[PDB]
Design a protein around this ligand. Structure first.
Ligand code: GDD
Ligand code: GTP
Ligand code: GTP
Lengths: 406, 360, 407
């Protein structure tokens, strides 16, 4: 038997995902219709031998997290527990702090997944490689562009034994095309270096990449497993859109009943579109590629929706165009209003993609990105929101362009 | 009288010129800035003047001991080994100005005016107080030391160097008449004459203001330098019209040295002064420019609002606009566009400068 | 018997031009050390015969609002009540909706005061002009710049009788350089035209006071002006509150000389006018430049340079930091050798009586360089520059930011 540890963050790691995170926690943001960690729990309960799923984070258990945990426990036939760490303990410090609960029942190995990644999660093939080799650390790696790889944790390996010889968390200079994916397979022996790291701290917070992956690289403990299935990070509020698009593309294999079909008496559907059943979509509303509709969403007639997330309880009145946007919970977009953004994906194989920095401005100018509307934002009739971020509970009366509307 | 010219040092505003020749010695309309001051002092009836040097006293002092025998007044010098600023040489020259119980002129080295020395000293003895300064009206008084002048007499009620609240509108013209009793008050430690001497003066009612007639400018920056030569050529148009060279192809007010030549088919546009020994080729259009000593401007160039220093060679088909200052002995290659280029001394330019930059 | 009505706004109507805060209500933001409406309450409770003080707004009753009401009631021994509207009713709709509460006790007159003004508040001078005149609407007006008069309510008066003849609320062309200060003396009959505006609509109860009652009743002998020379500013932006802080710390020299910070050469070096709370810990090596206001429980380390800044309560500035032109929010930490700098929004110093322009956070699609705002519980790391940035509340930075809005 095995178990999974999904490292969800806490409220400080959700600061970068801020317009969206004001209402829900970041790991519960619905990416292609289901919350962000439900893709992880989906992929982990698909593995034969999964006993437990242990979320580690420093979120307080509010109503949405505990209701999600009970819903995941019923839907996925597993005990899904939430281990709240007493302090922000870094990446590996919460795995070392909870080692008695992780190793309870003596699992053969355990997965360690970052909650902010979108992946196909090739957990079975990682397990095949681990049961072949039996090493302390198995990392998942992807190939990136040489220019984009500097935004990520670079891995220099040995292409015959697949041993990580070098690891650097964000190098200024080129190191390697292999980037860490935030998916790991630890054996129980892997909790013995972390102990050492913690003991060296006494002369509690352990960063897994800077203190364990970069230290034991080349000593025989850390190994790679490569893929090139889908992979994305979700850091800012608008990388949720790229993650949603990748997931809606892989629903063509894993859940094709989530994807909506045209059915000539209904709304006109291009590309991959998720529509929740509670949503009412008018038959003249064409829903373009990579759209996901939340529950309780009333989409009026003639509404064009392309490359967007419309969250729960939102309302798009007649003849609206919503492109590359995230319409928040309960937001209302009046008739002939245009909410337009600019596509900006992380995409580590795109040589023109931005670094996904925390600074949204270059020199006073807001860089063109996804248009985020917070919850309860009333966009008036006949008005354009272009490349803007609107903070929650803001009733607007005016056209806004390249602005953060506080 | 005595006359004290605090002559600045390191000349940081107006830097490409002062990197070769000090700021009292750079020729403003074909003779240096100190020379306008000291010829007006020799016309004023000042018996010997003293200048408070601290930087590049080799070329400066050799010029002063040249023209000491030409003006016929002893151009005495206060050397300093470190800069004392704006109230330090008041206290270094304590003995050399305390010898007579007579007032003395204190002049900024960079102000160019239509000075009224007779008006200033014989306005001064009408009230007989410790200090009587010259004031002028200006549109942006937040850059210069303002005053509050009362009606018909002119007592300085307040004095602040930067008003920042808009107290008033009149400003320091940069010329003062000081009485010898203010000499011993301040100490040799360097400070500012405006922050502490005049602001304690105004508390008594010993500072006075005389309103100027007009044409005041201090040439610290090259923009102020070119605005000042515009106003100086205007004053020459009003008062001495034959000094300006006007001819067939001359547009506006042009002041040419006799040694300077100008080719045919050229257009020497309004408010231009050409210094001595320059040679101007055929087909140029020079408007609002100063061209300093022995510089060359080759054929088919277009120069506007620019300073061409000593022994520069501006090539052919060369455009220069937007207060482009050239330092001493700069060679501009053919067909280059310089917008805003401050060019360091002894540089050869081989590329266009499309935005205002410093070239070093 | 007189009373006072302070029109405080509400959660959406604050519309912060560049935010002073995010989590405290805008009337309770401390300008020159004390909350913005406590200056109004001091000025009103100084007036003899003033019985009651009413705050009309549509903020929900949170805890800071209630504890400020109790603190003001205890400090001035006046009733200070908060009449909350059922909706945003505009500037005159809350006066008409609460007219039985306003006119209970039968006051002789009532002062209507905008919450976001910094004023000298010459309430007795307006009171004396009105006791001589006895007119329905008396307005305090100042003198504006010709360019900046278009942002306020402009008034064509008659200079013999001081009567408003024309009123435009926010014009596009120049009509006057007299501007409405936002301070009004209302007779108990001034509620009688407000009813009329309501009955023009009912043929709910929103009444713009300046656009419906002042713009349309001018020239009819009803509105009169009282021209003043004192300090006046509007507090909308963050730089507008720093300017109001400078004006109020100037006026503290002759109203509250105990409130300013003296040198005390065992303690911190004080330049200019500085308010320090008595409970704040300021290390003696820290030099505190002009127009600095320190809240309660603020810890200031050694060598801290504070110049033109509001440091809200609980904030900790560690050693050697430089905070200039900033509003360090409550509970925010600035670590060693960090520099939190903003750009001053200073009036045009070449021109007489330029008041202030309030920056609108974006000029033409570009972010404007202005005051740096740190939100509540913002952590600035050691050795980091924050320049012209707004840091949103509860955000631990890790690098130097420049001209951002860090969410
Ligand atoms: N109760 C209530 N109060 C409100 C409402 N809306 C605004 N207020 C408060 O009423 C005052 C009026 O502010 P605004 O309506 O936003 O206008 P203004 O830009 O401040 O202009 C007014 O004051 C200026 C002085 O600063 C004047 O120049 C101008 O004529 C006008 O009187 C402010 O304190 C505001 O917080 C409301 O709906 N209900
Ligand atoms: N449980 C838990 N999980 C965390 C914690 N910190 C981070 N994580 C998770 O692990 C991932 C790592 O994020 P970061 O802490 O930013 O580290 P990084 O991805 O290596 O990038 P850097 O910021 O450059 O260090 C986060 O996206 C979270 O999913 C923590 O303190 N506790
Ligand atoms: N003799 C002397 N005069 C000085 C010195 N420093 C300043 N002055 C005078 O002080 C007055 C005001 O100085 P500025 O207007 O700033 O001119 P500047 O000294 O050339 O300096 P910058 O233009 O700023 O580089 C001028 O008349 C200078 O001539 C000095 O060190 N020695």
């Amino acid at each position: 038997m095995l178990k999974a540890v999904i490292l969800i963050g806490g409220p400080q790691k959700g600061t970068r995902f801020r317009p969206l995170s004001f209402e829900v926690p970041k790991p519960l943001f619905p990416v292609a219709g289901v919350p962000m960690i439900q893709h992880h729990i989906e992929a982990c309960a698909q593995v034969p031998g999964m006993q437990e799923i242990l979320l580690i984070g420093f979120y307080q258990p509010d109503e949405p997290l505990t209701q999600f945990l009970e819903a995941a426990q019923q839907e996925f036939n597993l005990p899904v527990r939430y281990l709240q760490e007493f302090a922000p303990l870094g990446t590996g410090g919460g795995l070392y702090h909870f080692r008695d609960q992780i190793l309870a029942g003596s699992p053969e190995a355990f997965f360690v997944l970052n909650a902010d990644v979108c992946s196909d999660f090739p957990l079975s093939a990682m397990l095949e490689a681990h049961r072949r080799q039996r090493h302390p650390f198995l990392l998942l790696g992807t190939t990136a562009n040489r220019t984009q790889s500097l935004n990520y944790g670079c891995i220099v390996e040995n292409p015959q034994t697949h041993e990580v010889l070098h690891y650097v968390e964000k190098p200024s200079t080129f190191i390697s095309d292999i980037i860490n994916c935030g998916i790991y397979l630890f054996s129980p022996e892997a909790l013995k270096p972390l102990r050492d790291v913690f003991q060296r701290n006494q002369q509690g917070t352990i960063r897994l990449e800077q203190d364990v992956f970069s230290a034991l690289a080349g000593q025989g403990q850390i190994y790679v497993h490569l893929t090139d299935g889908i992979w994305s990070q979700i850091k800012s509020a608008g990388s949720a859109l790229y993650a949603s698009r990748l997931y809606l593309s892989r629903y063509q294999d894993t859940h094709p009943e989530r994807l909506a079909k045209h059915t000539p008496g209904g709304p006109w559907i291009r590309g991959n579109v998720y529509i929740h059943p509670t949503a009412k979509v008018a038959p003249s509303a064409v829903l373009g590629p990579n759209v996901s509709i939340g529950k309780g969403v009333t989409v009026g007639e003639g509404v064009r929706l392309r490359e967007s997330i419309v969250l729960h309880g939102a309302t798009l009145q007649e003849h609206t165009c919503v492109l590359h946007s995230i319409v928040g919970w309960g937001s209302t977009v009046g008739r002939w209003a245009r909410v337009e953004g600019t596509p900006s994906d992380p995409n580590p194989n795109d040589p023109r993609a931005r670094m996904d920095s925390e600074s949204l401005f270059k020199d006073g100018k807001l860089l063109p990105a996804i248009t985020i509307l917070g919850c309860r934002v009333r966009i008036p009739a006949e008005v354009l929101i272009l490349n803007s971020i609107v903070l929650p509970h803001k009733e607007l009366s005016r056209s806004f362009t390249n602005q953060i509307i506080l | 009288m005595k006359a004290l010219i605090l002559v600045g040092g390191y000349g940081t505003r107006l830097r490409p010129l002062t990197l070769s020749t000090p700021k009292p010695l750079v020729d403003f309309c074909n003779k240096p800035i100190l020379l306008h001051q000291v010829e007006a002092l020799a016309a004023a009836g000042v018996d010997h003047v003293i200048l408070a040097v601290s930087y590049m006293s080799q070329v400066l002092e050799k010029e002063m001991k040249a023209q000491e025998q030409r003006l016929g007044i002893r151009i005495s010098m206060s050397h300093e080994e470190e800069p004392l600023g704006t109230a330090g040489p008041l206290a270094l020259a304590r003995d050399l100005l305390s010898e007579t119980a007579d007032p003395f002129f204190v002049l900024n080295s960079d102000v160019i005016c239509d000075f009224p020395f007779q008006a200033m000293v014989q306005f001064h003895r009408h009230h007989g107080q410790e200090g009587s300064i010259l004031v002028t009206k200006v549109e942006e008084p937040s850059k210069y030391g303002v005053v509050v002048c009362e009606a018909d007499t002119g007592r300085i009620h307040r004095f602040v160097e930067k008003p920042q609240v808009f107290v008033s509108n009149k400003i320091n013209a940069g010329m003062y008449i000081l009485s010898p009793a203010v000499l011993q008050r301040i100490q040799l430690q360097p400070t500012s004459i405006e922050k502490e001497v005049f602001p304690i003066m105004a508390k008594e009612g010993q500072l006075y203001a005389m309103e100027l007639q007009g044409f005041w400018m201090d040439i610290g920056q090259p923009k102020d330098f070119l605005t000042g030569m515009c106003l100086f050529l205007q004053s020459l148009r009003q008062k001495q019209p034959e000094r300006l060279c006007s001819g067939p192809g001359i547009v506006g007010n042009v002041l040419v040295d006799p040694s300077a030549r100008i080719g045919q088919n050229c257009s020497i546009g309004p408010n231009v002064s050409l210094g001595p020994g320059v040679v101007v080729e055929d087909g140029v259009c020079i408007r609002r420019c100063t061209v300093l000593r022995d510089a060359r401007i080759r054929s088919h160039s277009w120069l506007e609002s620019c300073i061409v220093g000593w022994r520069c060679r501006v090539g052919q088909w060369v455009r220069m606009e937007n207060v482009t200052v050239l330092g001493e002995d700069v060679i501009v290659n053919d067909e280059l566009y310089l917008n805003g280029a401050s060019v360091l001394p002894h540089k050869s330019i081989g590329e266009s400068v499309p935005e205002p930059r410093i070239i070093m």
